[PDB]
Amino acid sequence: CQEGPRNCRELLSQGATLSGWYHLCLPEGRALPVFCDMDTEGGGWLVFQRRQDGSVDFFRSWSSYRAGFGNQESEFWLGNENLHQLTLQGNWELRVELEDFNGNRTFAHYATFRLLGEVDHYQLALGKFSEGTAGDSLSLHSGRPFTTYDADHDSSNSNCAVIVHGAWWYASCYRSNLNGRYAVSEAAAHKYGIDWASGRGVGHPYRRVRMMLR
Amino acid sequence: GPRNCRELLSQGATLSGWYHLCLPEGRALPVFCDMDTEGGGWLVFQRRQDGSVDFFRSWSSYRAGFGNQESEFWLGNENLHQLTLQGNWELRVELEDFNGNRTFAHYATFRLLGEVDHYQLALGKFSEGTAGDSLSLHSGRPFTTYDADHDSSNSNCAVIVHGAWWYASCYRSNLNGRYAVSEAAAHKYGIDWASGRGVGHPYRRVRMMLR
Amino acid sequence: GPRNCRELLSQGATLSGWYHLCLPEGRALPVFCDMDTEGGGWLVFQRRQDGSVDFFRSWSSYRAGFGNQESEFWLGNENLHQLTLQGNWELRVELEDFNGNRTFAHYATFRLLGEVDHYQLALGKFSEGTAGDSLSLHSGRPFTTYDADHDSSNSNCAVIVHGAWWYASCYRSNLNGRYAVSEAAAHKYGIDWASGRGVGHPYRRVRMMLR
Ligand SMILES: OC[C@H]1O[C@@H](O)[C@H](O)[C@@H](O)[C@H]1O
Ligand SMILES: [Ca+2]
Ligand SMILES: [Ca+2]
Ligand SMILES: [Ca+2]
């Protein structure tokens, strides 16, 4: 990792103005492909999660969430270890984008986002809510470890990941569940899906979601 | 690094997609290469498909380029100037209507002058094309955006027609105009090619390409 | 990238998509890596899925590769020969019918000889596969295109069946064959796998991949 840029803002500043896949050079000297959104809200956003069509299975294990998974062309999770390494230094603001089946867009912004390391179960450290038409459904999850079906760290007598078919910084269980089970419409919706409580509520999911940092 | 798409094709890159070019300033430039059409080696510098990207942008935005490699984009006037400094690049314009019929226009050469000359279009002869000629009018004219009026109208054509182009008063083509998903949704001024479907009768997909 | 998709995955490349491999000669080769299927690390060298790309192509086109990163392609015979000069590459064939049913075929090893040997297929033993074995017949045979007949037939298999393959007289598999959008539009010879749906009963989606 022969130098490279440290984030999407730096790529943009350097003249990379089209959104798409770029390599960042991580602090440890490892190259990482990432999707940079160079257009929304001034550009320079590192998109680390995307839901679009239900083509990719998000009901995955600790190791899968740790390393990342999915398809560049469609849906993915960048990986918790990548996110921890990226967010160690610098202030990264979080933007969440949501789109319902009508094509109505809503959003949520948070001042900072950081994940602790694997020993701390990639615990979420979330900054304060700034603004968002979708409302705040992630603050509850701040301070909580990540749990998957094979790594129960939540505050429930059960395994929330198993219970609600996802992976997240579950409590018992959630106000948000963006790595939840995909549904192509309300009819096909699951009890627990790609939900944002303060927007459309539990059991009433979104068609497209993105989570992004700048 | 490679300086264009034909160079890339010659070295064995035979699949159409995104590649990196090396600009004179030692800058890496992502570009879309069409490695198939008419033998291949075409740098696609503008694409419209779905209305997902806003094309009503400022001088600075058009100078730098904007958009999404996954969908619609404008490569950027400065990028285009630097690319076309040398060589004679042929221009191919591809249009697709709402029924899916494709038509085209071919111009012998395409070059943009520098920013001091307002990215003036230098265009060779229309050679052939089922879409007919709707760019010759614009040859020799500076680029105009809503915040930088260089056209031949007392008003600002970019504002009147909601786009950016080498406007006169105002246009025979307007490929950076406002997107419309169907006819029914058509704007008075849209993604238009006057010799093709005419002003006010837009296309669903457009590509502008150099080779 | 390193030598194959497994090595990329092992270095942290966990998202499926287009990566670069560095070939023996020192040429960078864009390839698609599937980082998920059966643990991931598969290099996909052929993909069919729409019919948007013409697969009835010449010897030199099959040598160099052709298609679109976003959709259908053939990686190229010379590329495959270079990749398989070293290492052990298992072949996985993925087939999908018009109902979404997915079947597979696995072979222990896969290698292509050089051009002087007409990119002859060197195929290992069929291990398992719900689609059954329809490539074993083709092992040890030269590749054939409409402009280069090397098959075991008095005719040109590539012309008769409209594709390109390691034809005998003619085939039990024809995955580079003419696309069909339905079972109703099916051709005498199409994208066929004898032991699967059989000759004349084509698939909607196909991938050929190595690990
Ligand atoms: O029993 C699980 C439940 O946990 C709640 O806190 C959450 O609001 C619901 O979405 C549901 O997941
Ligand atoms: Ca628990
Ligand atoms: Ca004016
Ligand atoms: Ca013969």
Side-chain angles (χ1 to χ4, degrees), chain A residues 1-88 90-103 105-106 108-156 158-214, chain B residues 1-24 26-98 100-124 126-211, chain C residues 1-2 4-24 26-124 126-159 161-182 184-187 190-211:
Chain A
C1 205
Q2 43 92 341
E3 323 245 341
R6 306 166 294 201
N7 54 49
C8 293
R9 315 182 88 149
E10 283 181 4
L11 277 162
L12 177 51
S13 197
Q14 280 171 6
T17 51
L18 269 25
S19 305
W21 291 89
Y22 290 86
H23 286 253
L24 304 190
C25 196
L26 297 173
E28 81 179 9
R30 168 174 59 97
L32 176 65
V34 301
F35 188 89
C36 293
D37 178 332
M38 300 309 205
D39 209 343
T40 87
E41 211 94 302
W45 296 93
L46 199 168
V47 181
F48 66 90
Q49 190 260 25
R50 187 162 72 179
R51 302 309 286 285
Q52 308 198 140
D53 58 12
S55 62
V56 173
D57 187 356
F58 272 67
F59 190 55
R60 310 266 194 116
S61 65
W62 184 261
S63 60
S64 287
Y65 272 94
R66 173 178 67 221
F69 63 83
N71 191 314
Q72 288 184 16
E73 189 186 44
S74 65
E75 305 184 318
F76 60 86
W77 176 261
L78 186 64
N80 292 342
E81 182 65 21
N82 287 325
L83 287 166
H84 174 251
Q85 287 177 24
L86 284 160
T87 64
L88 256 144
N91 282 54
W92 303 75
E93 54 184 332
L94 175 68
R95 171 174 169 106
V96 171
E97 298 186 349
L98 306 168
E99 186 180 308
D100 65 20
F101 301 103
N102 281 26
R105 297 205 264 110
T106 53
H109 289 68
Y110 298 86
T112 61
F113 171 98
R114 177 169 59 91
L115 299 189
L116 278 61
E118 191 174 7
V119 74
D120 290 309
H121 314 302
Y122 297 120
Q123 177 180 307
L124 177 61
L126 191 71
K128 304 297 184 186
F129 181 72
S130 64
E131 64 191 12
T133 55
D136 180 10
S137 288
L138 200 58
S139 291
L140 163 69
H141 291 101
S142 187
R144 299 179 183 275
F146 201 76
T147 108
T148 56
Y149 66 70
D150 63 326
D152 186 349
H153 304 298
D154 62 37
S155 61
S156 174
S158 66
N159 180 319
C160 284
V162 168
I163 294 301
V164 321
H165 213 259
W168 205 242
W169 304 273
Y170 293 119
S172 47
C173 290
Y174 74 82
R175 307 247 314 144
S176 52
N177 190 43
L178 301 181
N179 291 336
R181 191 161 192 187
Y182 197 86
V184 305
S185 65
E186 187 82 36
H190 319 261
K191 193 182 184 182
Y192 307 118
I194 301 169
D195 299 341
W196 193 262
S198 68
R200 309 199 332 116
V202 181
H204 311 293
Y206 295 87
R207 170 176 283 166
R208 303 174 59 97
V209 175
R210 300 196 298 173
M211 309 177 74
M212 48 212 294
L213 303 175
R214 178 173 72 179
Chain B
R3 301 287 190 272
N4 60 75
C5 292
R6 209 171 217 167
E7 201 163 301
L8 277 161
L9 177 58
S10 289
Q11 288 167 193
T14 45
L15 312 181
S16 298
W18 290 87
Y19 293 86
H20 289 89
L21 262 41
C22 201
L23 289 156
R27 231 207 88 205
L29 178 63
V31 300
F32 184 95
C33 297
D34 175 340
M35 299 312 205
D36 181 70
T37 303
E38 305 283 313
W42 294 93
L43 201 164
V44 173
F45 69 87
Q46 190 263 18
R47 191 163 70 188
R48 304 301 291 284
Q49 330 196 305
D50 64 13
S52 65
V53 174
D54 188 350
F55 273 70
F56 192 58
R57 307 221 188 192
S58 69
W59 187 260
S60 57
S61 287
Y62 269 92
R63 181 182 57 222
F66 60 83
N68 193 343
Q69 296 175 33
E70 302 191 326
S71 60
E72 307 178 316
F73 63 86
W74 178 256
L75 184 59
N77 291 344
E78 183 60 27
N79 286 148
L80 285 162
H81 175 237
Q82 292 294 323
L83 256 7
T84 55
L85 277 177
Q86 280 83 42
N88 72 154
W89 301 66
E90 50 173 329
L91 172 67
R92 172 179 173 96
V93 174
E94 298 186 346
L95 269 25
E96 185 174 315
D97 70 20
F98 299 113
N101 290 338
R102 302 186 68 86
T103 55
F104 320 93
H106 292 269
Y107 296 85
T109 59
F110 174 97
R111 171 177 54 266
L112 296 195
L113 279 36
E115 187 173 19
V116 37
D117 301 335
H118 313 121
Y119 294 119
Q120 179 173 122
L121 179 57
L123 190 71
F126 174 79
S127 68
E128 67 272 341
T130 55
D133 185 3
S134 296
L135 201 50
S136 291
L137 169 77
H138 299 279
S139 190
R141 302 179 182 277
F143 201 76
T144 283
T145 57
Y146 63 70
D147 63 338
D149 180 352
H150 308 295
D151 58 36
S152 66
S153 171
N154 182 66
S155 287
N156 185 334
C157 285
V159 173
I160 294 174
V161 312
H162 210 258
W165 205 244
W166 305 270
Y167 292 121
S169 198
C170 285
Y171 77 76
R172 294 252 307 154
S173 49
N174 191 40
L175 303 181
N176 295 332
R178 192 183 209 117
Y179 197 85
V181 303
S182 75
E183 231 183 2
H187 312 287
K188 297 301 188 308
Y189 295 120
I191 298 171
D192 294 345
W193 193 260
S195 69
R197 310 208 322 111
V199 181
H201 298 290
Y203 294 88
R204 178 151 62 206
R205 299 175 63 109
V206 162
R207 303 199 300 169
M208 307 175 72
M209 326 166 45
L210 301 172
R211 158 105 104 34
Chain C
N4 58 44
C5 293
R6 257 216 163 100
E7 284 177 2
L8 280 159
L9 172 56
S10 182
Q11 289 177 181
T14 52
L15 271 30
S16 298
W18 290 89
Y19 293 88
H20 289 258
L21 288 189
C22 193
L23 291 172
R27 172 173 58 103
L29 171 65
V31 299
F32 185 86
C33 296
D34 176 339
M35 296 315 202
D36 186 68
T37 302
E38 295 296 334
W42 298 89
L43 196 173
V44 173
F45 66 89
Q46 190 261 30
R47 193 160 67 193
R48 310 294 298 279
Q49 68 195 217
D50 282 334
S52 60
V53 172
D54 180 10
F55 271 69
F56 194 62
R57 306 245 194 169
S58 67
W59 178 261
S60 276
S61 292
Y62 270 92
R63 183 182 181 272
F66 59 84
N68 170 25
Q69 285 181 22
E70 133 203 313
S71 61
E72 305 181 319
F73 64 87
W74 178 255
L75 184 65
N77 288 340
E78 180 61 14
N79 285 328
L80 287 167
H81 171 237
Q82 292 298 323
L83 288 165
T84 58
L85 275 172
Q86 291 89 14
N88 300 316
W89 306 76
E90 173 184 15
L91 175 67
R92 168 173 169 104
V93 174
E94 297 191 344
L95 307 166
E96 174 170 326
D97 69 25
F98 292 98
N99 278 160
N101 297 120
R102 299 180 53 74
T103 48
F104 315 97
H106 296 90
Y107 301 83
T109 57
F110 171 99
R111 181 171 61 91
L112 299 193
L113 278 52
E115 182 164 9
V116 76
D117 289 315
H118 307 298
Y119 294 115
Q120 183 181 299
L121 178 63
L123 192 60
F126 178 77
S127 56
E128 63 185 358
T130 55
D133 177 7
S134 295
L135 206 49
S136 274
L137 165 74
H138 293 97
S139 192
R141 306 187 178 273
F143 199 76
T144 285
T145 57
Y146 72 88
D147 66 333
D149 177 349
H150 314 295
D151 61 35
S152 69
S153 166
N154 288 318
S155 295
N156 188 328
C157 282
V159 179
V161 317
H162 206 260
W165 206 247
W166 305 267
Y167 291 124
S169 189
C170 281
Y171 71 79
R172 277 170 58 74
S173 44
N174 190 43
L175 302 181
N176 287 333
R178 191 181 190 111
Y179 199 84
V181 201
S182 61
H187 312 99
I191 303 174
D192 304 328
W193 191 264
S195 63
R197 310 213 323 163
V199 175
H201 314 286
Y203 294 85
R204 182 174 63 192
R205 298 169 187 176
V206 169
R207 294 198 304 171
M208 300 178 69
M209 57 210 288
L210 303 174
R211 189 174 60 177

